[PDB]
């Protein structure tokens, strides 16, 4: 019960700290490097970032 | 590793020990904790004693052993930043060796540039011996108050200085005088007597037939049974000596401490029991406990100070400052040439080479300008500790000293609102600045010639 | 850890940027690259270096796409883009500690880059559209990134006269895609000469084009039945070709299945008809423009109208290599094509000659794309940094300290040329700073004299577009690295 | 940065509701339960000499105050937390930061003088407050339930001093067995010793005398060996000429001279280490005698009642007839020494402090009140000083505002609501406002029954606050590793 | 919450000690077998012996030994009951920490309830005469039956009572047990245990010659030194014997001389030639018992030897039974204010001899509480629930959350009848259910009985306990648990 509310609320906090500034030219970015295929994407919006990163957190499904 | 790469693996380590004592220079310094390999703890704000005893690997810091045993013994004032002052000439040479400049061209560049600034010091040189005894004694009061002692003695040095100056006047026409102190009391409660401090105890001695003397007796060999024991004691009372000193009633006197008793009393040591006579007896006012107090009515050559403080570390810091105070005052009365220190003397020599750099030009043009920038980093050390901008403050002071030829105005080590060292009565020995700024080039002669380091086996 | 994670990749990026510094200049040195297939490739440029280099750090991987843009433009001295990138990242570490935001540092580099382009326009030297005097001096000078100019005596007028005859003297685009670089074994570097027409890699003969594959009815009493039916379909094809008077046929890649039957070659041998197969489809652009050949999909649509036209076609055998030379070009085209046959003794020399000649063609394309001339030896890099150093004190602000570091990074390019030549880093630059105030702008620096001397008299000229594209691509790479504050490993 | 982690362990060592910290020694597997961190920081080893300085300065606070000696260490721990914030945010040199609190220290020292109330002449308020002293400062430990019981011991002891500043004349006796509520007050000099089985139990008008010394055939040698037994006869003969029926020796006495004392009717007392020899000589008027020949030199003691009585489990000594009120005796009783060992430090917190309080007549309201008043007075110097040290002046009051959070966290109540109501009540001009941990509210000291003597508040609340600023000048920087 | 985890682990260590002793509680308790590091096997249910050899590295568990040792100083008995009272309050303290109650509030709740429990015991006191037999056994009968030998305790019950009544005071003093010595010997049974009116010395002398078998009309002396030449030879020892015969001292008591003088063969033959009884190899701790009991003054030198320092006795003989040599002294002269007696203990195995010895020290400490306070209360855990009846009933007046911990102290009293039901082979709730209905209304002293398996009068089964047993123990047990909650953590130091 202690870690149930913690790990659920921090699901968007861990990878979302960089996208909080997305609005405005000063927004921080995030780099997603694939393990193979020589692919990657650089964006300040969490849309593509969240869908392309699998997570075991059940709160990530929402 | 050999070549230029090997020189960078050693010489560049001098910047590490320079930044360690950088914050400890002057009255603005901070207490640093040092641990010896044997387990002893040393805590002080004086950077001269910090780098004196230390365990390091690179030999670049081992050359500072001869520097610490010299500046502290010869002068003692302003010696906290002697390593930063020595590294100032090296830090400028580290940029020159990167350009490919030969070390001898760097050594001869700093050697000739330091000699040109000596003529500038002669123009601003003063003489404290030309004045009367009132001004000469007053200059000794504020000389070590604003500079030497960095611990607690900033306001209270008036008690330690007055007791030190009176000890100088009595012996004026310190190696023959033993000085120590016991933890206790306070700063203003210190006592001064004419004689040597005797910690051993046995009570009061009455005036004898002679004026102001006890006819003190000192015998090294013990009495040697009961018939001769009480017989030799009565022989001591024949001359009226109540106090007797013997190794095996004052007993167990050290070897060096026993000689200081005979020096103050102008007596002789009697090895036998047949040599006891009034001619071999010393002259001492009386011996009493107020540790026994040894007083001398007539003016003698032994005058010692008794340090008192509320902390055990104050006694070590105040006494060590007195060892350095006796060295500074000794050079002030012996050498009539004096200069105004506390940031004024270091900037004074910087403007001299700055004007001479454009006259010589040649290959030494940038070499003389580097020697000026090396002296400009010395006040930058006290600028950060006092809160002043090192680049901003010096740029203003160099502009004020350009129109007005008086160089006394400069960075204040105390941090007060008066930037004039002449107003604060800050006086440093001329030979002191010579053994610091000019003599630092001699230490650089060993560092600049470093090429290859040979490391042997076990 | 926004700063420390990004700084960890900067050290790995500056390490690669420092290693490629030895590949710049005529005094430089290249590296050996062993491919996974077992073939050895050695080149001075950073194109092959970054192509075969695999580093888990994403910053080192993004340097490949940034350098690839400059490789297609100049090809020589392209490592300076990465060297300048690694210099700005190292200088930004001290600027970041002053409290300046990374985007402000990134925006200050773009603001200083706009002034750098204007300096190149003010220092731009007038150059004529078509001349053999000016283009040869500028071609061989930019090639100094490798060892070229020794053998360039016959190579220098080749690239100058060929490109001008491909399109026109009107500049504008004049793309290099029409040039056919043919590599053959044998001969020397000086023996390389241009050909008046298109040559085949694999008397008055007509050259056709066939998109299908000649063969019996096998798309991708039984003894006489097979022989008669197969020879009947092949004979009908020979009758249609004989009526079209096409003596040279070209077939697409046959290595798959059907290939070409031997019975069809016997019927075409009596009519003296050429058969060439295993031709890449990319060669059709050279066949359609140069020879005027129209692709023929099926034999039913085969006719004379889709066939090409030529004056004299003959086979030339050079050092055992069979080459089909075409004399004369008759077609409707506004940009005739010119082919160059590269000759060399060893494959390592032939492969090095290609990149040396291809980079010599790109510098000519940079001249017809944007006209201009600049000094060589990194001399324009100092005058750009000299103006930005003075303009920083004029505008003051927070960009004054940034533009000073941006100007100091521009001095790394001329410093790299001195370090590779055995000259002291700072000692030479210190002497140059007095010479740059002497030479008065466009006066440049020579590598042989190791000092400031004339350019046009010493045959030293460089295009302005390379210096403009290098600053633009390097600025876009630095602003992207500092803008990314962290990385992630996922699918 | 070695003294920063010290404040976390001693944070629970302050306040009357604070919790004790268990100590465990690696040698002998012993244990100790105490509140004040004087013994805690001394027994626990420290790898950083920066924390060793905090231990050496705590030894002075033991005799000067002794109650909550860690109150000085927790201040420096909170100042270093705000000093590191000024090095980063404000980028101020540490020397200016340290002197920023030193310059503001003058306003804190002057705040104790302005709040000081002078009491003089009539002692009616002095003697009445002696009972109320035992209710606050005496026991901050688990013994707080004995405040009403121990009040009779501390009140009658101070009135017996009558201006006696000598602590060596006060004897502390711990009775084994019984209960803490069974501690009784006895009139006389109580010492824990014993006697012999055949020795006289009571002797009228006995004298006290101490000592610094230590007491052809196989049988043919008996003529030469009997001289050793005769050497003790010459010693007892000269002592017997003194006419003293009670003998005392520092070291142990052999059985042979022991029975020789019973033949002449002379009692023997042994097992005296330090306080047994020194205090007995001062109370009964004795002196160390190295002669034992003529009853002239030094001094001889006398006692009216030498009889031994049984107090609790082990019988102790009761000495009566002392004509000087300089010496006092406070007797306690307990089942185990766990609570008895810390009960001695309670006497050093108040009773031993009141001996030196006769010179200081100034008083100030303590128990969290005096620390908050200094934070209110220093705020007026923020706009006057200005400069770069103004940030250290405002941060100086932050360390004083975190002091009431120590008592709130140890009591379990929330420290946010209690301090918010404590500050607003004090800033309205009420100096008597203080923290109440019983009801979880803010009430005055007089309304909560917290009253102490006017001489005590200067040597405890005002002394530790003044001595703290003396000890807050220690510089803490990066040290040199061994 | 690190301090909350330390106290939680301390409760587990406290429950571990309470769960072990739980099997040894009450008269139905079970013995424990422990193997000492020295190789000696001691089997007993006494909490003082169990915790003496208990080796546990846990700091609080080591402190629990001193907690039970403190009860032995104030009382010295009831080790089958009051031992668990230490861990009883700590077992219910787990729910107190979850409610957020401050430890001082817990300490103030138990201390205030301790004073209330004393007043409840003062209401239930009964009139007990100073000299009686059956009534004084009822108070001890709870502690009289522990060891296997309790079957023969029917004869030992009046013996332990009459032993204390022999030397005692009617002024309600501390009743020091040093005057009553328990001497042991090899051979015999516990049923043959007898009491002697005079000092009995079981120490075995060297008995080299062993000429005299007994002495009639002899003066028992006390000699600290030893007779031997300093270390013509016999002439020095005969002169010492002449001084012995000068004072007519036929019995000599000498401590252990092997440190210096050792023993001489000539001195042993001279005393046997004159038929002088002597006892050697005596411990130094026996000097206090022999000096005060017989009224003899120690003598450190032969010069100090005289008649005034010597006692007297009617008949001094040595009893030989079952191979054991004991010395019985008939009659005592030079009477003083500290008379002494002796009780001869007979057993077979050395472990059995020490087994019955601890049962006697447990029984003798019972009368000490009856002489000091004549009050008497019910035993067998009956008042434990009766006290809880007067506690939880007032919980409605506690005015706030204090009522929660007020009921926990009353619920902690239910641990005593719970452990007795499990040790006697009965249901736990079935006993608690009957007690809550029985203690509700009718009379006093009623409670569960392990013998009859039901709630009835405890005095009908002759099972009671003194009032001071639970008075001092509960107050001491509630005080020790207060300091246990004062531990924030365990930190190792130098």
UniProtKB/Swiss-Prot annotation, chain A:
UniProt subcellular location: Cytoplasm
Protein family per UniProt: Belongs to the TCP-1 chaperonin family.
Source species taxonomy: Eukaryota, Fungi, Dikarya, Ascomycota, Saccharomycotina
Entry function: Molecular chaperone; assists the folding of proteins upon ATP hydrolysis. Known to play a role, in vitro, in the folding of actin and tubulin. In yeast may play a role in mitotic spindle formation.
Subunit comment: Heterooligomeric complex of about 850 to 900 kDa that forms two stacked rings, 12 to 16 nm in diameter. Interacts with PLP2; this interaction leads to inhibition of CCT complex mediated actin folding.
Name of protein: T-complex protein 1 subunit beta
Curated annotation (Swiss-Prot), chain B:
Gene3D superfamilies in alphabetical order: GroEL, GroEL-like equatorial domain, TCP-1-like chaperonin intermediate domain
GO cellular component: chaperonin-containing T-complex
Keywords, sorted A to Z: ATP-binding, Chaperone, Cytoplasm, Nucleotide-binding
Primary location class: cytoplasm
A Gene Ontology BP annotation from the UniProt entry: chaperone mediated protein folding independent of cofactor
Molecular-function annotations in GO: ATP binding; ATP hydrolysis activity; ATP-dependent protein folding chaperone; unfolded protein binding
Function: Molecular chaperone; assists the folding of proteins upon ATP hydrolysis. Known to play a role, in vitro, in the folding of actin and tubulin. In yeast may play a role in mitotic spindle formation.
The family this protein is said to belong to: Belongs to the TCP-1 chaperonin family.
Annotated protein name in UniProt: T-complex protein 1 subunit epsilon
Lineage start: Eukaryota, Fungi, Dikarya, Ascomycota, Saccharomycotina
Swiss-Prot record, chain E:
Cross-referenced Pfam families: Cpn60_TCP1
Localization, UniProt: Cytoplasm
Any GO BP annotation: protein folding
GO molecular function terms listed in the Swiss-Prot or TrEMBL record: ATP binding; ATP hydrolysis activity; ATP-dependent protein folding chaperone; unfolded protein binding
PROSITE patterns in alphabetical order: TCP1_1, TCP1_2, TCP1_3
Domain of life from the UniProt record: Eukaryota
Range of residues in the leader sequence: none
Gene Ontology cellular component list: chaperonin-containing T-complex
Keywords: ATP-binding, Chaperone, Cytoplasm, Nucleotide-binding
Family: Belongs to the TCP-1 chaperonin family.
Other comments on record: Present with 5530 molecules/cell in log phase SD medium.
Quaternary state and interactors: Heterooligomeric complex of about 850 to 900 kDa that forms two stacked rings, 12 to 16 nm in diameter.
Functional note: Molecular chaperone; assists the folding of proteins upon ATP hydrolysis. Known to play a role, in vitro, in the folding of actin and tubulin. In yeast may play a role in mitotic spindle formation.
NCBIfam families (UniProt xref): chap_CCT_delta (TIGR02342), thermosome_alpha (NF041082), thermosome_beta (NF041083)
Name of the protein in question: T-complex protein 1 subunit delta
């Amino acid at each position: 019960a202690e870690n149930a509310r913690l790990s659920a609320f921090v699901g968007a906090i861990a990878v979302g700290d960089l996208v909080k500034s997305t609005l405005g030219p000063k927004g921080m970015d995030k780099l997603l490097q694939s393990a193979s295929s020589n692919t990657c994407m650089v964006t300040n919006d969490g849309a593509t970032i969240l869908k392309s990163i699998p997570l075991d957190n059940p709160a990530a499904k929402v | 590793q050999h070549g230029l790469e090997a020189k960078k693996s050693h010489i560049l380590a001098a910047r590490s020990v320079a930044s360690i004592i950088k914050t400890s220079l002057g009255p603005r310094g901070l207490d640093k904790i040092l641990i010896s390999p044997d387990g002893e703890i040393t805590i002080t704000n004086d950077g001269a004693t910090i780098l004196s005893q230390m365990e390091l690997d690179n030999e670049i810091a081992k050359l500072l052993v001869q520097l610490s045993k010299s500046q502290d013994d010869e002068i003692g004032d302003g010696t906290t930043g002697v390593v930063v002052l020595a590294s100032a000439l090296l830090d400028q040479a580290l940029e020159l060796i990167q350009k490919g400049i030969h070390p001898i061209k760097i050594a001869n560049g700093f050697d000739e540039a330091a000699k040109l600034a000596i003529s500038k010091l002669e123009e601003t040189c003063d003489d404290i011996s030309a004045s009367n005894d009132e001004l000469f004694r007053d200059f000794l009061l504020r000389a070590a108050k604003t500079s030497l002692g960095s611990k607690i003695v900033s306001k209270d040095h008036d008690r330690f200085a007055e007791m030190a100056v009176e000890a100088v006047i009595n012996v004026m026409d310190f190696d023959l005088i033993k000085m120590q102190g016991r933890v206790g009391g306070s700063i203003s409660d210190s006592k001064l007597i004419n004689g040597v401090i005797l910690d051993k105890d046995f009570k009061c001695v009455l005036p004898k037939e002679g004026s102001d003397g006890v006819k003190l007796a000192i015998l090294t060999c013990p009495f040697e049974e009961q018939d001769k024991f009480k017989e030799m004691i009565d022989d001591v009372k024949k001359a009226g000596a109540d106090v007797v000193i013997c190794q095996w009633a004052v007993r167990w006197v050290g070897g060096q401490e026993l000689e200081h008793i005979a020096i103050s009393t102008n007596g002789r040591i009697v090895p036998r029991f047949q040599d006891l006579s009034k001619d071999k007896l010393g002259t001492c006012s009386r011996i009493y406990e107020q540790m026994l107090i040894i007083e001398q009515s007539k003016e003698t050559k032994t005058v010692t100070c008794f340090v008192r403080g509320s902390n055990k570390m104050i006694v070590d810091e105040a006494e060590r400052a007195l060892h350095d105070s006796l060295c500074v005052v000794r050079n002030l009365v012996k050498d009539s040439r004096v200069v105004y220190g506390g940031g004024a003397a270091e900037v004074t020599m910087s403007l001299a080479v700055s004007e001479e750099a454009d006259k010589q030009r040649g290959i030494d043009q940038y070499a003389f300008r580097g020697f000026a920038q090396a002296l400009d980093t010395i006040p930058m050390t006290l600028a950060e500790n006092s809160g002043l901008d090192p680049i901003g403050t010096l740029s203003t002071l160099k502009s004020k000293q350009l129109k007005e030829k008086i160089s006394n105005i400069g960075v204040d080590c105390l941090g007060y609102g008066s930037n004039d060292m002449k107003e604060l009565f800050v006086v440093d020995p001329f030979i002191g600045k010579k053994q610091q700024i000019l003599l630092a080039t001699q230490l650089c002669r060993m560092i600049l010639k470093i090429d290859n380091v040979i490391i042997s086996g076990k | 850890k926004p700063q420390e994670v990004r700084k960890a990749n900067i050290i790995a990026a500056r390490s690669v940027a420092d290693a490629i510094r030895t590949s710049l200049g005529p005094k430089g040195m290249d590296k050996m690259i062993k491919t996974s297939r077992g073939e050895i490739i050695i080149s001075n440029d950073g194109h092959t270096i970054l192509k075969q280099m695999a580093i888990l750090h994403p910053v080192a991987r993004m340097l490949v796409e940034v350098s690839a843009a400059q490789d297609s433009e100049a090809g020589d001295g392209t490592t300076s883009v990465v060297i300048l990138t690694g210099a700005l990242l190292g200088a930004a570490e001290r600027l970041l500690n002053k409290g300046i935001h990374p985007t402000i540092i990134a925006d200050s580099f773009q603001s200083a880059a706009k002034r750098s382009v204007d300096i190149l326009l003010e220092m731009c030297h007038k150059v004529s559209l078509s001349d053999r005097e000016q283009l040869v001096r500028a071609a061989s000078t930019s090639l100094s990134s490798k060892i070229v100019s020794q053998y360039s005596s016959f190579l220098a007028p080749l690239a100058v006269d060929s490109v001008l005859k491909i399109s026109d003297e009107n500049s504008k685009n004049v793309d290099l895609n029409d040039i056919r670089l043919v590599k053959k074994v044998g001969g020397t570097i000086d023996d390389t000469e241009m050909i008046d027409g298109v040559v085949l890699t694999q008397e008055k003969a007509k050259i056709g084009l066939i998109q299908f594959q000649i063969s019996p009815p096998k798309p991708d009493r039984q003894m006489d039945k097979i022989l008669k039916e197969e020879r009947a379909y092949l004979l009908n094809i020979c009758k249609k070709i004989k009526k079209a008077k096409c003596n040279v046929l070209l077939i697409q890649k046959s290595i798959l299945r059907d290939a070409v039957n031997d019975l069809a070659l016997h019927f075409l041998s009596k009519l003296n008809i050429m058969v060439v197969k295993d031709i890449e489809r990319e060669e059709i652009e050279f066949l359609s423009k140069g020879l005027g050949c129209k692709p023929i999909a099926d034999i039913e649509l085969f006719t004379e109208d889709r066939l090409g036209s030529a004056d004299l076609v003959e086979e030339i055998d050079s050092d055992g290599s069979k080459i089909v030379r075409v004399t004369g070009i008759r077609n409707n085209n506004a940009r005739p094509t010119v082919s160059v046959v590269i000759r060399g003794a060893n494959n390592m020399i032939i492969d090095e000659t290609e990149r040396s000649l291809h980079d010599a063609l790109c510098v000519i394309r940079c001249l017809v794309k944007e006209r201009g001339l600049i000094a060589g030896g990194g001399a324009p890099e100092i005058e750009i940094s000299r103006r930005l150093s003075k303009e920083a004190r004029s505008m003051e602000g927070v960009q004054a300290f940034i533009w000073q570091e941006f100007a100091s990074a521009l001095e790394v390019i001329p410093t790299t040329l001195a370090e590779n030549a055995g000259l002291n880093s700072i000692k030479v630059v210190t002497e140059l700073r007095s010479k740059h105030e002497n030479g008065e702008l466009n006066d440049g620096i020579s590598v042989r004299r190791s000092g400031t001397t004339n350019t046009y008299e010493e045959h030293i000229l460089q295009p302005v577009l390379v210096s403009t594209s290098a600053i633009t691509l390097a600025s876009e790479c630095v602003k992207s690295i500092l803008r990314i504050d962290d990385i992630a490993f996922s699918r | 940065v070695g003294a920063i982690a010290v404040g976390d362990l001693v944070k629970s060592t302050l306040g009357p509701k604070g919790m004790d910290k268990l100590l465990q020694s690696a040698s002998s597997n012993t244990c100790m339960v105490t509140n004040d961190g004087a013994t805690i920081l001394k027994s626990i080893p420290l790898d950083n000499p920066a924390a060793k300085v905090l231990v050496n300065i705590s030894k002075v606070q033991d005799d000067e105050v002794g109650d909550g000696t860690t109150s000085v260490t927790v201040l420096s721990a909170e100042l270093l937390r705000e000093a590191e914030k000024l090095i980063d945010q404000s980028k101020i040199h540490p020397q200016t930061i340290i002197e920023g609190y030193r310059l503001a220290s003058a306003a804190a020292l002057d705040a104790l003088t302005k709040a000081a109330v002078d009491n003089s002449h009539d002692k009616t308020m002095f003697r009445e407050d002696l009972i109320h002293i035992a209710k606050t400062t005496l026991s901050s430990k688990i013994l707080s339930q004995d405040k009403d019981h121990f009040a009779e011991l501390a009140t009658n002891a101070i009135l017996r001093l009558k201006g006696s500043t000598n602590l060596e004349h006060i004897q502390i006796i711990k009775i084994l067995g019984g209960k803490l509520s069974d501690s009784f007050l006895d009139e006389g000099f109580i010492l824990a010793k014993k006697f012999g089985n055949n020795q006289p139990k009571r002797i009228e008008n006995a004298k006290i005398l101490i000592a610094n010394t230590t007491l052809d055939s196989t049988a043919k040698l008996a003529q030469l060996e009997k001289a050793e037994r005769e050497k003790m006869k010459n010693k007892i003969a000269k002592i017997s000429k003194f006419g003293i029926n009670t003998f005392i020796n520092r070291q142990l006495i052999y059985d042979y001279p022991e029975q020789l004392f019973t033949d002449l009717g002379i009692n023997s007392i042994e097992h005296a280490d330090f306080e047994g020899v020194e205090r007995l000589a001062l109370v009964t008027g004795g002196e160390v005698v190295s002669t034992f020949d003529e009853p002239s030199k030094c001094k001889l003691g006398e006692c009216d009642v030498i009889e031994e009585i049984m107090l609790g489990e082990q019988p102790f000594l009761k000495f009566s007839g002392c004509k000087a009120g300089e010496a006092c005796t406070i007797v306690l009783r307990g089942a185990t020494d766990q609570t008895l060992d810390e009960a001695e430090r309670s006497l050093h917190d108040a009773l031993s402090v009141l001996s030196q309080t006769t010179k200081e007549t100034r008083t100030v309201l303590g128990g969290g009140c005096a620390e908050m008043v200094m934070s209110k007075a220093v705020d007026t110097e923020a706009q006057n000083i200005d400069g770069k040290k103004s940030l250290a002046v405002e941060a100086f009051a932050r360390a004083l505002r975190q002091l009431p959070t120590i008592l709130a966290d140890n009591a379990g109540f929330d420290s946010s609501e209690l301090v918010s109501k404590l500050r607003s009540s004090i800033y309205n001009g009420i100096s008597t406002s203080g923290l109440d941990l019983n009801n979880g509210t803010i009430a005055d000291m007089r309304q909560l029954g917290i009253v102490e003597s006017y001489k005590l508040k200067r040597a405890v609340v005002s002394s530790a606050s003044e001595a703290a600023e003396v000890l807050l000048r220690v510089d803490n920087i990066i040290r040199a590793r061994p």
